[PDB]
Amino acid sequence: SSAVNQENERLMEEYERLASELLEWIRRTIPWLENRTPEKTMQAMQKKLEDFRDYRRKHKPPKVQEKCQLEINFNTLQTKLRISNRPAFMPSEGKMVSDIAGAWQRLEQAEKGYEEWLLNEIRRLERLEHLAEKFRQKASTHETWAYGKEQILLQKDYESASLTEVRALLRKHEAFESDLAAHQDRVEQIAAIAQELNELDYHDAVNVNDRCQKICDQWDRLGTLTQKRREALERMEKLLETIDQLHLEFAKRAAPFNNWMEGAMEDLQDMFIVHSIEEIQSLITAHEQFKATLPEADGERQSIMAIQNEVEKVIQSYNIRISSSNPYSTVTMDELRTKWDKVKQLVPIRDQSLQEELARQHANERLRRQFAAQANAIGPWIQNKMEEIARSSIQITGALEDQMNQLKQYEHNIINYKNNIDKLEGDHQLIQEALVFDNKHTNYTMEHIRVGWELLLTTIARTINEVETQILTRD
Amino acid sequence: SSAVNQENERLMEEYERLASELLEWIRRTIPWLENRTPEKTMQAMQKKLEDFRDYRRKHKPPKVQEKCQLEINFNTLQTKLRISNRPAFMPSEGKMVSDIAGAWQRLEQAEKGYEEWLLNEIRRLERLEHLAEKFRQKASTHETWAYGKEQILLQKDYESASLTEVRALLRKHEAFESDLAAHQDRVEQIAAIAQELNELDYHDAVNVNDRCQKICDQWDRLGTLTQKRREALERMEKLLETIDQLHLEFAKRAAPFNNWMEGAMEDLQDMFIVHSIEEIQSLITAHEQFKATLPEADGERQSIMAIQNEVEKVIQSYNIRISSSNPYSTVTMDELRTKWDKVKQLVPIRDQSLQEELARQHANERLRRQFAAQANAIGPWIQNKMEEIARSSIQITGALEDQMNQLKQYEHNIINYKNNIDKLEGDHQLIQEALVFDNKHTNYTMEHIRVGWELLLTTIARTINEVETQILTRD
């Protein structure tokens, strides 16, 4: 009888030693799950899932078949104690047989979404770890590109530059603008990566947001810093372009004008030699016409001096480099004036010179005329007396005494006419001393008169003589 | 009787003392005229004419009246000795009375064109003295202008010049040409004055002809010397203009091309992350298309390297200054190549990178498929057995023993199917270790199978148990 009671004890003691053995597991296990305390890296957060596998795979199943094994024992030892009759057993209250239904429903609870969690974290640390590294890299290459760019952008090289040098920098600046717009994208990306990096509560979101902020701030500063340059370069080009135009204009006009002044200075000093009033007057008509051009000449002079003034003005009103000196022209504005002064100074000297010759020529004509007037009278007078002597033979009375009487009267006329020949002779001397050897106002010439007068004096002498013989070789 | 003979002696002695007194004058005078020995200056040559005046005016006339006075005496003492009868006198044979007609015709000869001469000389020394002074002056101002002109014309300043500097000198050279043509006339005049100066036997014709010759020789040398310059300057401008064009072209093309290389280097290194074969293939299609552009990329590369070569060539084939360096561009041809090499070096690294991910994704799909295949079989298998157990009550014979017989057979099937669940579990672990958490090839998931299989094991255990009670609370 107690032989059956011996195993009906082990078959009810079996329950205890096991039903408990389980209960303490759902005890030690419900805390392990339920945890959900995130991890640092991903590589460590997945080792946490490898633990869950080992659990749900090799540790939890055997328990499920033990939760079932029990209650099966709570029957093979229940319905069995009915077929032997002697009230069964509902052991340890601290090991209920209808409550392990809760102790497991407990574990099942704490396990709820644990793997769902584990995964999502593996996946966040997935993207995260990637973006972090991408950010670190995409930023580093940008920061490296940026180094010094702002500084060189502030350099002012272009102040002492030439129209072409500036024009060149302007073109290299185009390159810079080009390259600048290139990276526009990289900046937007660097922002975006830092952005998402936040959304995923990246542990270092703080520092990436800062590093990114600097980059975006710089980018903006860089943008306008780049625009200042274009403006300055574009402005500098404008000025130099203007100053160049002026210089050019000045050169194109000072040249010809310098030739004119040089030409004039020569003309106003050209040596001349004349011998007639008409000649010296052509020289006067000429000089007169020249002086007539002096007005507009001064026009051009001032006009040119204007061009120079603007140049020197725009330069001065921009404290800009580039020696006012004109690359396209040799002659200065200051030496341009000295020349003009000379022209001027030479004019009064020229006409004063022209004036004296005019007087000279006129003085010469006077001598010419005065000589002509007298010779034109003396000439015929001498001719007339020759004729009077050539006659004298006639006489109504019968020659000799009456012819003599007449000859002596002519001699008296002759004698009394001498002073006229003298005068002539004297004005002749003046004509020659004046280097005048042409006289269109008479066909005479001191010589003709001399011979004529000398012939006259000889003819009377001869004739009076012949008549003296007559009144002798007869009387 | 001898009272009349006393004055008829003085009136015949009068003849002698005078007729002689004259004869010696035409003697001393014929040599004075006849002279015609030119003089130095004009001022002295006219003092020679002032002598002639004094002669022909106050010295010669009185003699003419003395030549006449005689012969008149040769009659008042001839016809007179007839009216007293006693043969007259024809005195001194060395004092003829019919020959003073020749002694005077002699003087008249020697006087011939003496004044005509004197004048013409006054007139030659007139023009002469003027031209000489004009020459001396017009030459001096030219020689002064010329000093140094030839030297500065030979200066080569323009070698190390810039396109603009040369372009400037070229324009200042225009001025020089202008001013040069200006004096063309002055030279022609200087020649002419020396010319005439000869025609008038200028005493210094020798030296003026030399001084003039130099001037004309210089003028010619000056002319061509001036033309060399224009050519050199025009030539230099040509070169610099060409070299500039090239530099410019190079700059306009190296810029964009430099942006491309920089852009590529980035793309070929851009970090990426994928989770599907489709994703990694888009990355491959892209990279493939990029590489497709590499050919023409090299085209442009070489083309640009060409431009540089010509530049460096024309320079080198004219031993011309101007550092080959490109004013319009920063990036060098040598650093341009280093970049290109980098692009190249990065390609094989990129596809090698792209290659590994493709393998990874494929490896992943394999695990995905292998898992699906098994789960899609195990799933229904577990479902089917639940149904077989769910029945088993039937039996044509009348439950229990025959139902049990069947339950035990199912248990045996279950047991023998376990290895399948194991495998699954193991490929599950691979899928997770590969960071693959998506599987479109099955609607199962390791979990579903676990629960299912665990439910199965519990259902048979339970059922076989319940049937054990049956065959007890009946048997």
From Swiss-Prot, chains A, B:
Keyword vocabulary terms for this entry: Actin-binding, Calcium, Cardiomyopathy, Cytoplasm, Disease variant, Metal-binding, Phosphoprotein, Repeat, Ubl conjugation
Intracellular or extracellular location(s): Cytoplasm, Myofibril, Sarcomere, Z line
Tissue: Expressed in both skeletal and cardiac muscle.
Posttranslational modification: Ubiquitinated by FBXL22, leading to proteasomal degradation.
Principal location listed in the UniProt entry: cytoplasm
Chain positions of Spectrin repeats: 10-120, 130-235, 245-356, 366-469
BP term (GO), one: protein localization to plasma membrane
GO CC, alphabetical: actin filament; cell junction; cell projection; cortical actin cytoskeleton; cytoskeleton; cytosol; dendritic spine; extracellular exosome
GO MF: actin filament binding; calcium ion binding; channel activator activity; cytoskeletal protein binding; FATZ binding; identical protein binding; integrin binding; LIM domain binding
Associated clinical condition: Cardiomyopathy, familial hypertrophic, 23, with or without left ventricular non-compaction: A hereditary heart disorder characterized by ventricular hypertrophy, which is usually asymmetric and often involves the interventricular septum. The symptoms include dyspnea, syncope, collapse, palpitations, and chest pain. They can be readily provoked by exercise. The disorder has inter- and intrafamilial variability ranging from benign to malignant forms with high risk of cardiac failure and sudden cardiac death. Cardiomyopathy, dilated, 1AA, with or without left ventricular non-compaction: A disorder characterized by ventricular dilation and impaired systolic function, resulting in congestive heart failure and arrhythmia. Patients are at risk of premature death.
Function: F-actin cross-linking protein which is thought to anchor actin to a variety of intracellular structures. This is a bundling protein.
Self-association state and partner proteins as the record states: Homodimer; antiparallel. Also forms heterodimers with ACTN3. Interacts with ADAM12, MYOZ1, MYOZ2 and MYOZ3. Interacts via its C-terminal region with the LDB3 PDZ domain. Interacts with XIRP2. Interacts with DST isoform 1 (via N-terminus). Interacts with PARVB. Interacts with SYNPO2.
Record family assignment: Belongs to the alpha-actinin family.
Protein's recorded name: Alpha-actinin-2
